[PDB]
């Protein structure tokens, strides 16, 4: 997705706390792209006795 961050002219990739890349620079233009995994969330089932 899009991003609102700001890299220095030389820095290429953004690294987060877990040492996994989250901000990438385009190889052919000067823009920054954000990485976020596919939509996720825990599902819980509520039911009375079967």
């Amino acid at each position: 997705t899009e991003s609102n961050k700001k890299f220095l002219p030389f820095q290429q990739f953004g690294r987060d706390i877990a040492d996994t890349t989250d901000a990438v620079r385009d190889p052919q233009t000067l823009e920054i792209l954000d990485i976020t995994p596919c939509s996720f969330g825990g599902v819980s089932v509520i039911t009375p006795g079967t």
């Binding site: 609102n4 961050k5 706390i17 969330g41």
Partner: protein, 50 residues
């Protein structure tokens, strides 16, 4: 006994000593939860909570 009974003037019926007790202790963050859409923007206040 006006220093340990609830005060109806307060928004959430908390005794005056309880206010000092809550404010002295600091939590991990101002809010217990950080919802899915809360951490979309990388505000500087966003700590390791989300």
């Amino acid at each position: 006994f006006s220093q340990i009974l609830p005060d109806p003037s307060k928004p959430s019926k908390r005794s005056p000593i309880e206010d000092l007790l809550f404010n002295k202790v600091t939590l991990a963050d101002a809010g217990f939860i950080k919802q899915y859409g809360d951490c979309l923007g990388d505000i500087a206040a966003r700590d390791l909570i989300c």
